[PDB]
Write an enzyme that holds these catalytic residues in place. Structure first.
Site, PDB file in Angstrom:
ATOM      1  CG  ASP A  22      87.902  71.990  19.143  1.00  0.00           C
ATOM      2  OD1 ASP A  22      88.308  71.049  19.836  1.00  0.00           O
ATOM      3  OD2 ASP A  22      88.601  72.587  18.302  1.00  0.00           O
TER       4      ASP A  22
ATOM      5  CG  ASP B  19      91.666  66.575  33.662  1.00  0.00           C
ATOM      6  OD1 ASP B  19      91.195  65.655  34.365  1.00  0.00           O
ATOM      7  OD2 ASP B  19      92.267  66.364  32.588  1.00  0.00           O
TER       8      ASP B  19
ATOM      9  CG  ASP C 246      93.259  65.345  17.204  1.00  0.00           C
ATOM     10  OD1 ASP C 246      92.270  65.956  16.748  1.00  0.00           O
ATOM     11  OD2 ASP C 246      93.387  65.075  18.423  1.00  0.00           O
TER      12      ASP C 246
ATOM     13  CB  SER D  96      89.297  65.588  18.106  1.00  0.00           C
ATOM     14  OG  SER D  96      90.183  66.655  18.234  1.00  0.00           O
TER      15      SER D  96
ATOM     16  CG  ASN E  43      90.614  70.112  17.210  1.00  0.00           C
ATOM     17  OD1 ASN E  43      89.895  69.561  18.049  1.00  0.00           O
ATOM     18  ND2 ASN E  43      90.760  71.418  17.157  1.00  0.00           N
TER      19      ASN E  43
ATOM     20  CG  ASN F 260      89.068  68.101  23.109  1.00  0.00           C
ATOM     21  OD1 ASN F 260      89.059  66.873  23.207  1.00  0.00           O
ATOM     22  ND2 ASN F 260      89.689  68.879  23.969  1.00  0.00           N
TER      23      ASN F 260
ATOM     24  CD  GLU G 136      88.534  78.249  22.871  1.00  0.00           C
ATOM     25  OE1 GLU G 136      88.442  77.836  21.695  1.00  0.00           O
ATOM     26  OE2 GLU G 136      89.537  77.996  23.600  1.00  0.00           O
TER      27      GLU G 136
END
Ligand SMILES: [Cl-]
Ligand SMILES: [Cl-]
Ligand SMILES: [Cl-]
Ligand SMILES: [Cl-]
Ligand code: NA
Ligand code: NA
Length: 129
Positions: A52, A101, A48, A50, A46, A59, A35
């Site tokens: 990270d 999650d 969209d 967003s 990203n 994110n 990462e």
């Protein structure tokens, strides 16, 4: 900060990630390598809109507030810039919420594609822990 491999493993171990939700420490080190290359100041946009942040590339759509991700959440209740600190506490504590999650470490695309199903213990081999 750019961590060494075993330095990061020790830090993660002290913060309780070793076998957290059944994921042995090597999984976390492997994910961090791919990462962020172990760099706490890593950021990546990203498609969209967003972003990270940090060593585990957490994110802004769901997990932190950066003031520029419209219609997002802040489920870790932290500014995203806290995730870039040389102190990894905030990244680790937020990662514990993410991994809990429902999808485990599959939340990190790089873990699924580069670590899952491999000999992740190699990532901690030789380290004094
Ligand atoms: Cl390495
Ligand atoms: Cl494991
Ligand atoms: Cl730390
Ligand atoms: Cl799981
Ligand atoms: Na391991
Ligand atoms: Na957000």
């Amino acid at each position: 900060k750019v961590f060494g491999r075993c330095e990061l493993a020790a830090a993660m171990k002290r913060h309780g990630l070793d076998n957290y939700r059944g994921y042995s420490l090597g999984n976390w080190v492997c994910a961090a390598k791919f990462e962020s290359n172990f760099n706490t100041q890593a950021t990546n946009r990203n498609t969209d809109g967003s972003t990270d942040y940090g060593i585990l590339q957490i994110n802004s759509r769901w997990w932190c507030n950066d003031g520029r991700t419209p219609g997002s959440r802040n489920l870790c209740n932290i500014p995203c810039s806290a995730l870039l600190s040389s102190d990894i506490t905030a990244s680790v504590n937020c990662a514990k919420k993410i991994v809990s999650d429902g999808n485990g470490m599959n939340a990190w695309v790089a873990w699924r594609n580069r670590c899952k199903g491999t000999d992740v213990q190699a990532w901690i081999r030789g380290c004094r822990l």
